[PDB]
Scaffold this active site. Structure first.
Site, PDB file in Angstrom:
ATOM      1  N   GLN A  62       6.691  27.330 -21.303  1.00 12.93           N
ATOM      2  CA  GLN A  62       6.342  28.803 -20.908  1.00 12.93           C
ATOM      3  C   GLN A  62       4.855  28.984 -20.512  1.00 12.93           C
ATOM      4  O   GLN A  62       4.183  28.481 -21.187  1.00 12.93           O
ATOM      5  CB  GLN A  62       6.885  29.717 -21.841  1.00 12.93           C
ATOM      6  CG  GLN A  62       6.562  31.125 -21.631  1.00 12.93           C
ATOM      7  CD  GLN A  62       7.647  32.204 -22.324  1.00 12.93           C
ATOM      8  OE1 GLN A  62       8.297  31.876 -23.164  1.00 12.93           O
ATOM      9  NE2 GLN A  62       7.205  33.347 -22.203  1.00 12.93           N
ATOM     10  N   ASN A 101      11.319  37.504 -20.253  1.00  9.14           N
ATOM     11  CA  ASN A 101      11.339  38.848 -20.258  1.00  9.14           C
ATOM     12  C   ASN A 101      11.430  39.290 -21.756  1.00  9.14           C
ATOM     13  O   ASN A 101      11.415  38.762 -22.659  1.00  9.14           O
ATOM     14  CB  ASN A 101      12.627  39.573 -19.453  1.00  9.14           C
ATOM     15  CG  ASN A 101      13.955  39.216 -20.139  1.00  9.14           C
ATOM     16  OD1 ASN A 101      14.170  39.475 -21.215  1.00  9.14           O
ATOM     17  ND2 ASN A 101      14.716  38.485 -19.094  1.00  9.14           N
TER      18      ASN A 101
END
EC number: 5.2.1.8
Length: 163
Positions: A62, A101
């Site tokens: 990420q 998110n």
């Protein structure tokens, strides 16, 4: 027709290699365009010089938090956040590129590169691309991760742009 962008990855400032991505502008054009523009920096901000702050081997890499470098920042080319465009595409295996998110309709600039099939994310995270070349480089990055996601060396995007 779909755009291809690249990241040149460095580890503690040592070159590692290049990962390229196909972005599915045909199926999620708004989400694809955000990532494309952040990769070229054409809006005046973007991914160049940012880090991968969370890497969990056998799960994901990420990144994309170019404002706070730790998962708490980032912004889109449309503002702080934008909506979930659609969920047509699924998390089918390694190499999938999906939006991070914090709830419904809270997309910013953070993304993850899956290194496994992550079907439980389907319908919750917008899939918008896939690794085209350099999956072996993503696999090399994975090795600097850990169970809690902290990287043992600083994994950065040294350069990026559109091919």
């Amino acid at each position: 027709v779909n755009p291809t962008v690249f990241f040149d990855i460095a580890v503690d400032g040592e070159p590692l290699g290049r990962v390229s991505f196909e972005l599915f502008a045909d199926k999620v054009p708004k989400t694809a365009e955000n990532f494309r523009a952040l990769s070229t920096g054409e809006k005046g901000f973007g991914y160049k010089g940012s880090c991968f702050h969370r890497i969990i081997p056998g799960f994901m890499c990420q990144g994309g938090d170019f404002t706070r470098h730790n998962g708490t920042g980032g912004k889109s080319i449309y503002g702080e956040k934008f909506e979930d465009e659609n969920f047509i595409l699924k998390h089918t295996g390694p190499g999938i590129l999906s939006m991070a998110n914090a709830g419904p309709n809270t997309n910013g600039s953070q993304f993850f590169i899956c290194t496994a099939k992550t079907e439980w994310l389907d319908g919750k995270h917008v899939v918008f691309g896939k690794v085209k070349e350099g999956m072996n480089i993503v696999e090399a990055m994975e090795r600097f991760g850990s169970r809690n996601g902290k990287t043992s060396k600083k994994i950065t995007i040294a350069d990026c742009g559109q091919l």
